[PDB]
Amino acid sequence: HHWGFGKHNGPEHWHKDFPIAKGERQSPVDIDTHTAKYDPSLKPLSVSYDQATSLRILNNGHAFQVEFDDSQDKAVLKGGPLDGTYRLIQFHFHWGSLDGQGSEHTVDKKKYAAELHLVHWNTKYGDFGKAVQQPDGLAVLGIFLKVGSAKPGLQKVVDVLDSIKTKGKSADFTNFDPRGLLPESLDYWTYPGSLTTPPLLECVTWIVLKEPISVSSEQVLKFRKLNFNGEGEPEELMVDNWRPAQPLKNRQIKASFK
Ligand SMILES: [Zn+2]
Known part of the structure:
Protein backbone atom coordinates (compact mmCIF):
# COMPACT_ATOMS: atom_id res chain seq x y z
CA HIS A 1 0.00 0.00 0.00
CA HIS A 2 2.47 2.64 -1.18
CA TRP A 3 1.82 6.24 -2.20
CA GLY A 4 0.10 7.04 -5.46
CA PHE A 5 -2.69 9.06 -7.01
CA GLY A 6 -5.63 6.78 -6.27
CA LYS A 7 -8.53 7.39 -3.91
CA HIS A 8 -6.77 5.76 -0.95
CA ASN A 9 -3.12 6.68 -1.43
CA GLY A 10 -3.14 10.09 -3.10
CA PRO A 11 -1.60 13.41 -2.04
CA GLU A 12 -3.84 13.83 1.03
CA HIS A 13 -2.38 10.56 2.42
CA TRP A 14 1.29 11.16 1.73
CA HIS A 15 2.01 12.86 5.06
CA LYS A 16 1.56 9.54 6.86
CA ASP A 17 4.63 8.04 5.21
CA PHE A 18 6.36 11.39 4.56
CA PRO A 19 5.65 13.86 7.38
CA ILE A 20 7.55 16.63 5.57
CA ALA A 21 4.43 16.77 3.38
CA LYS A 22 3.21 19.37 5.92
CA GLY A 23 6.55 21.17 5.96
CA GLU A 24 7.53 24.82 5.69
CA ARG A 25 8.59 24.87 2.03
CA GLN A 26 6.38 22.43 0.15
CA SER A 27 5.56 22.48 -3.58
CA PRO A 28 3.73 23.16 -5.73
CA VAL A 29 2.10 26.48 -4.84
CA ASP A 30 -0.32 28.91 -6.41
CA ILE A 31 1.56 31.80 -8.03
CA ASP A 32 -0.31 35.01 -7.17
CA THR A 33 0.92 37.19 -10.02
CA HIS A 34 -0.06 40.41 -8.30
CA THR A 35 1.81 39.55 -5.08
CA ALA A 36 5.00 38.25 -6.74
CA LYS A 37 7.71 40.91 -6.44
CA TYR A 38 9.78 41.97 -9.44
CA ASP A 39 13.40 41.41 -8.40
CA PRO A 40 15.99 43.70 -10.10
CA SER A 41 18.76 41.36 -8.97
CA LEU A 42 17.45 38.37 -10.91
CA LYS A 43 19.74 37.53 -13.81
CA PRO A 44 18.55 36.06 -17.12
CA LEU A 45 18.14 32.28 -16.95
CA SER A 46 20.96 30.43 -18.73
CA VAL A 47 19.81 27.19 -20.35
CA SER A 48 22.59 25.33 -22.15
CA TYR A 49 21.10 22.17 -23.68
CA ASP A 50 23.08 21.98 -26.96
CA GLN A 51 25.09 18.96 -25.75
CA ALA A 52 22.29 17.18 -23.85
CA THR A 53 22.50 13.38 -24.14
CA SER A 54 19.26 11.51 -23.50
CA LEU A 55 19.53 7.80 -22.72
CA ARG A 56 16.25 6.22 -21.82
CA ILE A 57 12.59 6.74 -21.13
CA LEU A 58 10.92 4.96 -18.22
CA ASN A 59 7.37 4.41 -16.93
CA ASN A 60 8.05 4.69 -13.19
CA GLY A 61 4.49 3.96 -12.12
CA HIS A 62 3.41 7.55 -11.47
CA ALA A 63 4.70 9.25 -14.63
CA PHE A 64 7.23 8.73 -17.42
CA GLN A 65 10.75 10.11 -17.17
CA VAL A 66 13.28 10.83 -19.89
CA GLU A 67 16.73 10.37 -18.36
CA PHE A 68 19.98 12.00 -19.38
CA ASP A 69 23.67 11.19 -19.06
CA ASP A 70 24.70 13.57 -16.27
CA SER A 71 28.28 12.32 -15.86
CA GLN A 72 29.71 15.39 -17.62
CA ASP A 73 28.82 19.08 -17.76
CA LYS A 74 26.64 18.79 -20.86
CA ALA A 75 23.15 20.14 -20.18
CA VAL A 76 23.29 22.84 -17.54
CA LEU A 77 21.09 25.45 -15.96
CA LYS A 78 22.68 28.50 -14.35
CA GLY A 79 22.08 32.20 -13.77
CA GLY A 80 18.64 33.43 -12.80
CA PRO A 81 18.32 33.00 -9.03
CA LEU A 82 20.98 30.29 -8.98
CA ASP A 83 24.49 30.23 -7.61
CA GLY A 84 26.69 27.79 -9.47
CA THR A 85 25.84 25.16 -12.08
CA TYR A 86 23.01 22.61 -12.12
CA ARG A 87 23.12 19.55 -14.38
CA LEU A 88 20.07 18.07 -16.16
CA ILE A 89 19.25 14.54 -15.03
CA GLN A 90 15.68 13.93 -16.21
CA PHE A 91 12.44 15.50 -17.29
CA HIS A 92 8.89 14.30 -16.69
CA PHE A 93 5.36 15.64 -16.84
CA HIS A 94 2.23 15.94 -14.72
CA TRP A 95 -1.16 15.88 -16.47
CA GLY A 96 -4.90 15.62 -15.99
CA SER A 97 -7.79 13.41 -17.01
CA LEU A 98 -9.23 16.51 -18.73
CA ASP A 99 -7.68 19.62 -20.33
CA GLY A 100 -9.02 21.74 -17.45
CA GLN A 101 -6.57 20.34 -14.90
CA GLY A 102 -3.17 18.71 -14.73
CA SER A 103 -0.62 21.31 -13.73
CA GLU A 104 0.91 21.35 -10.26
CA HIS A 105 1.68 25.04 -10.03
CA THR A 106 -1.23 27.33 -10.71
CA VAL A 107 -1.25 30.95 -11.85
CA ASP A 108 -3.83 33.08 -10.06
CA LYS A 109 -5.55 29.74 -9.34
CA LYS A 110 -5.53 28.82 -13.05
CA LYS A 111 -4.75 25.15 -13.77
CA TYR A 112 -3.02 24.24 -17.04
CA ALA A 113 -3.50 20.92 -18.91
CA ALA A 114 -0.07 19.71 -17.89
CA GLU A 115 3.30 20.73 -16.51
CA LEU A 116 6.81 19.81 -17.61
CA HIS A 117 9.59 19.53 -15.02
CA LEU A 118 13.23 19.60 -16.10
CA VAL A 119 15.17 18.45 -13.04
CA HIS A 120 18.79 19.57 -12.44
CA TRP A 121 21.18 18.94 -9.56
CA ASN A 122 23.81 21.28 -8.10
CA THR A 123 27.22 20.12 -9.29
CA LYS A 124 28.83 21.19 -6.01
CA TYR A 125 27.18 18.13 -4.40
CA GLY A 126 28.67 15.59 -6.80
CA ASP A 127 25.52 13.66 -7.65
CA PHE A 128 21.74 13.67 -7.46
CA GLY A 129 21.52 11.49 -4.36
CA LYS A 130 23.65 13.87 -2.30
CA ALA A 131 22.07 16.98 -3.80
CA VAL A 132 18.53 16.17 -2.64
CA GLN A 133 19.75 16.25 0.96
CA GLN A 134 20.69 19.94 0.60
CA PRO A 135 18.47 23.06 0.69
CA ASP A 136 19.96 24.26 -2.62
CA GLY A 137 20.48 20.81 -4.13
CA LEU A 138 18.08 20.98 -7.07
CA ALA A 139 16.82 23.48 -9.61
CA VAL A 140 13.65 22.45 -11.36
CA LEU A 141 12.53 24.33 -14.45
CA GLY A 142 8.75 24.16 -14.72
CA ILE A 143 6.90 24.82 -17.98
CA PHE A 144 3.12 24.89 -18.35
CA LEU A 145 1.36 23.09 -21.20
CA LYS A 146 -1.87 24.33 -22.76
CA VAL A 147 -3.89 22.54 -25.44
CA GLY A 148 -3.82 24.15 -28.89
CA SER A 149 -1.31 23.79 -31.72
CA ALA A 150 0.97 20.75 -31.64
CA LYS A 151 4.49 20.97 -30.24
CA PRO A 152 6.65 19.29 -32.92
CA GLY A 153 9.53 18.82 -30.50
CA LEU A 154 7.33 16.73 -28.22
CA GLN A 155 6.22 14.24 -30.84
CA LYS A 156 9.20 11.89 -30.48
CA VAL A 157 8.24 11.51 -26.82
CA VAL A 158 4.57 10.87 -27.61
CA ASP A 159 5.40 8.23 -30.22
CA VAL A 160 7.48 6.09 -27.84
CA LEU A 161 4.81 5.91 -25.11
CA ASP A 162 3.13 2.81 -26.61
CA SER A 163 6.32 0.88 -25.84
CA ILE A 164 6.29 1.83 -22.15
CA LYS A 165 2.57 1.54 -21.39
CA THR A 166 2.91 -0.09 -17.96
CA LYS A 167 4.88 0.44 -14.75
CA GLY A 168 8.48 -0.74 -15.01
CA LYS A 169 8.77 -0.63 -18.80
CA SER A 170 11.70 1.28 -20.28
CA ALA A 171 13.00 2.00 -23.77
CA ASP A 172 16.12 3.35 -25.43
CA PHE A 173 15.57 7.06 -25.98
CA THR A 174 18.68 8.66 -27.43
CA ASN A 175 19.32 11.91 -29.25
CA PHE A 176 16.29 13.69 -27.87
CA ASP A 177 16.76 17.47 -27.79
CA PRO A 178 14.95 19.11 -24.86
CA ARG A 179 15.38 22.55 -26.46
CA GLY A 180 12.33 21.62 -28.53
CA LEU A 181 10.17 21.80 -25.41
CA LEU A 182 11.02 25.39 -24.43
CA PRO A 183 8.80 28.41 -25.00
CA GLU A 184 10.07 31.57 -26.64
CA SER A 185 10.47 33.64 -23.47
CA LEU A 186 12.48 32.68 -20.39
CA ASP A 187 10.65 35.12 -18.11
CA TYR A 188 10.09 33.29 -14.81
CA TRP A 189 8.87 33.23 -11.24
CA THR A 190 11.07 31.67 -8.59
CA TYR A 191 10.67 30.49 -5.00
CA PRO A 192 12.18 27.86 -2.64
CA GLY A 193 10.27 24.61 -2.48
CA SER A 194 10.32 20.84 -2.60
CA LEU A 195 10.05 17.74 -4.72
CA THR A 196 6.38 17.23 -5.54
CA THR A 197 6.48 13.44 -5.27
CA PRO A 198 7.65 11.52 -2.20
CA PRO A 199 10.07 11.86 -0.54
CA LEU A 200 8.97 15.52 -0.94
CA LEU A 201 12.42 16.75 0.07
CA GLU A 202 12.84 20.49 0.61
CA CYS A 203 15.78 20.83 -1.73
CA GLN A 252 7.95 35.18 -1.29
CA ILE A 253 7.72 34.40 -4.98
CA LYS A 254 9.97 36.63 -7.08
CA ALA A 255 9.47 37.58 -10.72
CA SER A 256 12.24 38.10 -13.27
CA PHE A 257 10.00 40.51 -15.18
CA LYS A 258 7.77 43.52 -14.53
ZN1 LIG B 1 7.38 16.93 -11.33
Missing part, protein backbone atom coordinates in the same frame (compact mmCIF):
# COMPACT_ATOMS: atom_id res chain seq x y z
CA VAL A 204 14.42 22.65 -4.79
CA THR A 205 14.85 26.14 -6.20
CA TRP A 206 11.77 26.39 -8.41
CA ILE A 207 11.99 28.34 -11.65
CA VAL A 208 8.56 28.46 -13.32
CA LEU A 209 8.31 29.94 -16.80
CA LYS A 210 5.54 32.46 -17.40
CA GLU A 211 5.00 31.45 -21.04
CA PRO A 212 3.28 28.10 -21.60
CA ILE A 213 4.02 25.85 -24.53
CA SER A 214 1.15 24.68 -26.71
CA VAL A 215 0.63 20.96 -27.32
CA SER A 216 -2.14 19.33 -29.34
CA SER A 217 -5.16 17.51 -27.99
CA GLU A 218 -3.84 14.36 -29.73
CA GLN A 219 -0.48 14.72 -27.95
CA VAL A 220 -1.94 15.00 -24.43
CA LEU A 221 -4.47 12.24 -25.17
CA LYS A 222 -1.57 9.87 -25.70
CA PHE A 223 -0.18 10.75 -22.24
CA ARG A 224 -3.57 9.60 -20.92
CA LYS A 225 -3.20 6.15 -22.51
CA LEU A 226 -0.35 5.25 -20.17
CA ASN A 227 -1.01 2.96 -17.17
CA PHE A 228 -0.10 3.37 -13.47
CA ASN A 229 -0.22 -0.41 -13.12
CA GLY A 230 2.26 -3.05 -14.22
CA GLU A 231 1.69 -5.49 -17.07
CA GLY A 232 -0.79 -8.21 -16.18
CA GLU A 233 -2.47 -6.11 -13.51
CA PRO A 234 -5.91 -4.43 -13.65
CA GLU A 235 -5.79 -1.38 -15.92
CA GLU A 236 -5.71 2.04 -14.31
CA LEU A 237 -5.10 4.95 -16.65
CA MET A 238 -2.18 7.22 -15.79
CA VAL A 239 -4.07 10.50 -15.34
CA ASP A 240 -4.20 13.21 -12.68
CA ASN A 241 -0.68 12.56 -11.43
CA TRP A 242 -0.44 16.11 -10.07
CA ARG A 243 -0.04 17.26 -6.48
CA PRO A 244 -2.32 20.21 -5.61
CA ALA A 245 -1.12 23.62 -4.42
CA GLN A 246 0.37 23.71 -0.92
CA PRO A 247 0.45 26.54 1.63
CA LEU A 248 2.95 29.27 0.74
CA LYS A 249 3.71 29.89 4.42
CA ASN A 250 6.79 32.03 4.99
CA ARG A 251 7.80 32.48 1.35
Whole structure:
Protein backbone atom coordinates (compact mmCIF):
# COMPACT_ATOMS: atom_id res chain seq x y z
CA HIS A 1 0.00 0.00 0.00
CA HIS A 2 2.47 2.64 -1.18
CA TRP A 3 1.82 6.24 -2.20
CA GLY A 4 0.10 7.04 -5.46
CA PHE A 5 -2.69 9.06 -7.01
CA GLY A 6 -5.63 6.78 -6.27
CA LYS A 7 -8.53 7.39 -3.91
CA HIS A 8 -6.77 5.76 -0.95
CA ASN A 9 -3.12 6.68 -1.43
CA GLY A 10 -3.14 10.09 -3.10
CA PRO A 11 -1.60 13.41 -2.04
CA GLU A 12 -3.84 13.83 1.03
CA HIS A 13 -2.38 10.56 2.42
CA TRP A 14 1.29 11.16 1.73
CA HIS A 15 2.01 12.86 5.06
CA LYS A 16 1.56 9.54 6.86
CA ASP A 17 4.63 8.04 5.21
CA PHE A 18 6.36 11.39 4.56
CA PRO A 19 5.65 13.86 7.38
CA ILE A 20 7.55 16.63 5.57
CA ALA A 21 4.43 16.77 3.38
CA LYS A 22 3.21 19.37 5.92
CA GLY A 23 6.55 21.17 5.96
CA GLU A 24 7.53 24.82 5.69
CA ARG A 25 8.59 24.87 2.03
CA GLN A 26 6.38 22.43 0.15
CA SER A 27 5.56 22.48 -3.58
CA PRO A 28 3.73 23.16 -5.73
CA VAL A 29 2.10 26.48 -4.84
CA ASP A 30 -0.32 28.91 -6.41
CA ILE A 31 1.56 31.80 -8.03
CA ASP A 32 -0.31 35.01 -7.17
CA THR A 33 0.92 37.19 -10.02
CA HIS A 34 -0.06 40.41 -8.30
CA THR A 35 1.81 39.55 -5.08
CA ALA A 36 5.00 38.25 -6.74
CA LYS A 37 7.71 40.91 -6.44
CA TYR A 38 9.78 41.97 -9.44
CA ASP A 39 13.40 41.41 -8.40
CA PRO A 40 15.99 43.70 -10.10
CA SER A 41 18.76 41.36 -8.97
CA LEU A 42 17.45 38.37 -10.91
CA LYS A 43 19.74 37.53 -13.81
CA PRO A 44 18.55 36.06 -17.12
CA LEU A 45 18.14 32.28 -16.95
CA SER A 46 20.96 30.43 -18.73
CA VAL A 47 19.81 27.19 -20.35
CA SER A 48 22.59 25.33 -22.15
CA TYR A 49 21.10 22.17 -23.68
CA ASP A 50 23.08 21.98 -26.96
CA GLN A 51 25.09 18.96 -25.75
CA ALA A 52 22.29 17.18 -23.85
CA THR A 53 22.50 13.38 -24.14
CA SER A 54 19.26 11.51 -23.50
CA LEU A 55 19.53 7.80 -22.72
CA ARG A 56 16.25 6.22 -21.82
CA ILE A 57 12.59 6.74 -21.13
CA LEU A 58 10.92 4.96 -18.22
CA ASN A 59 7.37 4.41 -16.93
CA ASN A 60 8.05 4.69 -13.19
CA GLY A 61 4.49 3.96 -12.12
CA HIS A 62 3.41 7.55 -11.47
CA ALA A 63 4.70 9.25 -14.63
CA PHE A 64 7.23 8.73 -17.42
CA GLN A 65 10.75 10.11 -17.17
CA VAL A 66 13.28 10.83 -19.89
CA GLU A 67 16.73 10.37 -18.36
CA PHE A 68 19.98 12.00 -19.38
CA ASP A 69 23.67 11.19 -19.06
CA ASP A 70 24.70 13.57 -16.27
CA SER A 71 28.28 12.32 -15.86
CA GLN A 72 29.71 15.39 -17.62
CA ASP A 73 28.82 19.08 -17.76
CA LYS A 74 26.64 18.79 -20.86
CA ALA A 75 23.15 20.14 -20.18
CA VAL A 76 23.29 22.84 -17.54
CA LEU A 77 21.09 25.45 -15.96
CA LYS A 78 22.68 28.50 -14.35
CA GLY A 79 22.08 32.20 -13.77
CA GLY A 80 18.64 33.43 -12.80
CA PRO A 81 18.32 33.00 -9.03
CA LEU A 82 20.98 30.29 -8.98
CA ASP A 83 24.49 30.23 -7.61
CA GLY A 84 26.69 27.79 -9.47
CA THR A 85 25.84 25.16 -12.08
CA TYR A 86 23.01 22.61 -12.12
CA ARG A 87 23.12 19.55 -14.38
CA LEU A 88 20.07 18.07 -16.16
CA ILE A 89 19.25 14.54 -15.03
CA GLN A 90 15.68 13.93 -16.21
CA PHE A 91 12.44 15.50 -17.29
CA HIS A 92 8.89 14.30 -16.69
CA PHE A 93 5.36 15.64 -16.84
CA HIS A 94 2.23 15.94 -14.72
CA TRP A 95 -1.16 15.88 -16.47
CA GLY A 96 -4.90 15.62 -15.99
CA SER A 97 -7.79 13.41 -17.01
CA LEU A 98 -9.23 16.51 -18.73
CA ASP A 99 -7.68 19.62 -20.33
CA GLY A 100 -9.02 21.74 -17.45
CA GLN A 101 -6.57 20.34 -14.90
CA GLY A 102 -3.17 18.71 -14.73
CA SER A 103 -0.62 21.31 -13.73
CA GLU A 104 0.91 21.35 -10.26
CA HIS A 105 1.68 25.04 -10.03
CA THR A 106 -1.23 27.33 -10.71
CA VAL A 107 -1.25 30.95 -11.85
CA ASP A 108 -3.83 33.08 -10.06
CA LYS A 109 -5.55 29.74 -9.34
CA LYS A 110 -5.53 28.82 -13.05
CA LYS A 111 -4.75 25.15 -13.77
CA TYR A 112 -3.02 24.24 -17.04
CA ALA A 113 -3.50 20.92 -18.91
CA ALA A 114 -0.07 19.71 -17.89
CA GLU A 115 3.30 20.73 -16.51
CA LEU A 116 6.81 19.81 -17.61
CA HIS A 117 9.59 19.53 -15.02
CA LEU A 118 13.23 19.60 -16.10
CA VAL A 119 15.17 18.45 -13.04
CA HIS A 120 18.79 19.57 -12.44
CA TRP A 121 21.18 18.94 -9.56
CA ASN A 122 23.81 21.28 -8.10
CA THR A 123 27.22 20.12 -9.29
CA LYS A 124 28.83 21.19 -6.01
CA TYR A 125 27.18 18.13 -4.40
CA GLY A 126 28.67 15.59 -6.80
CA ASP A 127 25.52 13.66 -7.65
CA PHE A 128 21.74 13.67 -7.46
CA GLY A 129 21.52 11.49 -4.36
CA LYS A 130 23.65 13.87 -2.30
CA ALA A 131 22.07 16.98 -3.80
CA VAL A 132 18.53 16.17 -2.64
CA GLN A 133 19.75 16.25 0.96
CA GLN A 134 20.69 19.94 0.60
CA PRO A 135 18.47 23.06 0.69
CA ASP A 136 19.96 24.26 -2.62
CA GLY A 137 20.48 20.81 -4.13
CA LEU A 138 18.08 20.98 -7.07
CA ALA A 139 16.82 23.48 -9.61
CA VAL A 140 13.65 22.45 -11.36
CA LEU A 141 12.53 24.33 -14.45
CA GLY A 142 8.75 24.16 -14.72
CA ILE A 143 6.90 24.82 -17.98
CA PHE A 144 3.12 24.89 -18.35
CA LEU A 145 1.36 23.09 -21.20
CA LYS A 146 -1.87 24.33 -22.76
CA VAL A 147 -3.89 22.54 -25.44
CA GLY A 148 -3.82 24.15 -28.89
CA SER A 149 -1.31 23.79 -31.72
CA ALA A 150 0.97 20.75 -31.64
CA LYS A 151 4.49 20.97 -30.24
CA PRO A 152 6.65 19.29 -32.92
CA GLY A 153 9.53 18.82 -30.50
CA LEU A 154 7.33 16.73 -28.22
CA GLN A 155 6.22 14.24 -30.84
CA LYS A 156 9.20 11.89 -30.48
CA VAL A 157 8.24 11.51 -26.82
CA VAL A 158 4.57 10.87 -27.61
CA ASP A 159 5.40 8.23 -30.22
CA VAL A 160 7.48 6.09 -27.84
CA LEU A 161 4.81 5.91 -25.11
CA ASP A 162 3.13 2.81 -26.61
CA SER A 163 6.32 0.88 -25.84
CA ILE A 164 6.29 1.83 -22.15
CA LYS A 165 2.57 1.54 -21.39
CA THR A 166 2.91 -0.09 -17.96
CA LYS A 167 4.88 0.44 -14.75
CA GLY A 168 8.48 -0.74 -15.01
CA LYS A 169 8.77 -0.63 -18.80
CA SER A 170 11.70 1.28 -20.28
CA ALA A 171 13.00 2.00 -23.77
CA ASP A 172 16.12 3.35 -25.43
CA PHE A 173 15.57 7.06 -25.98
CA THR A 174 18.68 8.66 -27.43
CA ASN A 175 19.32 11.91 -29.25
CA PHE A 176 16.29 13.69 -27.87
CA ASP A 177 16.76 17.47 -27.79
CA PRO A 178 14.95 19.11 -24.86
CA ARG A 179 15.38 22.55 -26.46
CA GLY A 180 12.33 21.62 -28.53
CA LEU A 181 10.17 21.80 -25.41
CA LEU A 182 11.02 25.39 -24.43
CA PRO A 183 8.80 28.41 -25.00
CA GLU A 184 10.07 31.57 -26.64
CA SER A 185 10.47 33.64 -23.47
CA LEU A 186 12.48 32.68 -20.39
CA ASP A 187 10.65 35.12 -18.11
CA TYR A 188 10.09 33.29 -14.81
CA TRP A 189 8.87 33.23 -11.24
CA THR A 190 11.07 31.67 -8.59
CA TYR A 191 10.67 30.49 -5.00
CA PRO A 192 12.18 27.86 -2.64
CA GLY A 193 10.27 24.61 -2.48
CA SER A 194 10.32 20.84 -2.60
CA LEU A 195 10.05 17.74 -4.72
CA THR A 196 6.38 17.23 -5.54
CA THR A 197 6.48 13.44 -5.27
CA PRO A 198 7.65 11.52 -2.20
CA PRO A 199 10.07 11.86 -0.54
CA LEU A 200 8.97 15.52 -0.94
CA LEU A 201 12.42 16.75 0.07
CA GLU A 202 12.84 20.49 0.61
CA CYS A 203 15.78 20.83 -1.73
CA VAL A 204 14.42 22.65 -4.79
CA THR A 205 14.85 26.14 -6.20
CA TRP A 206 11.77 26.39 -8.41
CA ILE A 207 11.99 28.34 -11.65
CA VAL A 208 8.56 28.46 -13.32
CA LEU A 209 8.31 29.94 -16.80
CA LYS A 210 5.54 32.46 -17.40
CA GLU A 211 5.00 31.45 -21.04
CA PRO A 212 3.28 28.10 -21.60
CA ILE A 213 4.02 25.85 -24.53
CA SER A 214 1.15 24.68 -26.71
CA VAL A 215 0.63 20.96 -27.32
CA SER A 216 -2.14 19.33 -29.34
CA SER A 217 -5.16 17.51 -27.99
CA GLU A 218 -3.84 14.36 -29.73
CA GLN A 219 -0.48 14.72 -27.95
CA VAL A 220 -1.94 15.00 -24.43
CA LEU A 221 -4.47 12.24 -25.17
CA LYS A 222 -1.57 9.87 -25.70
CA PHE A 223 -0.18 10.75 -22.24
CA ARG A 224 -3.57 9.60 -20.92
CA LYS A 225 -3.20 6.15 -22.51
CA LEU A 226 -0.35 5.25 -20.17
CA ASN A 227 -1.01 2.96 -17.17
CA PHE A 228 -0.10 3.37 -13.47
CA ASN A 229 -0.22 -0.41 -13.12
CA GLY A 230 2.26 -3.05 -14.22
CA GLU A 231 1.69 -5.49 -17.07
CA GLY A 232 -0.79 -8.21 -16.18
CA GLU A 233 -2.47 -6.11 -13.51
CA PRO A 234 -5.91 -4.43 -13.65
CA GLU A 235 -5.79 -1.38 -15.92
CA GLU A 236 -5.71 2.04 -14.31
CA LEU A 237 -5.10 4.95 -16.65
CA MET A 238 -2.18 7.22 -15.79
CA VAL A 239 -4.07 10.50 -15.34
CA ASP A 240 -4.20 13.21 -12.68
CA ASN A 241 -0.68 12.56 -11.43
CA TRP A 242 -0.44 16.11 -10.07
CA ARG A 243 -0.04 17.26 -6.48
CA PRO A 244 -2.32 20.21 -5.61
CA ALA A 245 -1.12 23.62 -4.42
CA GLN A 246 0.37 23.71 -0.92
CA PRO A 247 0.45 26.54 1.63
CA LEU A 248 2.95 29.27 0.74
CA LYS A 249 3.71 29.89 4.42
CA ASN A 250 6.79 32.03 4.99
CA ARG A 251 7.80 32.48 1.35
CA GLN A 252 7.95 35.18 -1.29
CA ILE A 253 7.72 34.40 -4.98
CA LYS A 254 9.97 36.63 -7.08
CA ALA A 255 9.47 37.58 -10.72
CA SER A 256 12.24 38.10 -13.27
CA PHE A 257 10.00 40.51 -15.18
CA LYS A 258 7.77 43.52 -14.53
ZN1 LIG B 1 7.38 16.93 -11.33
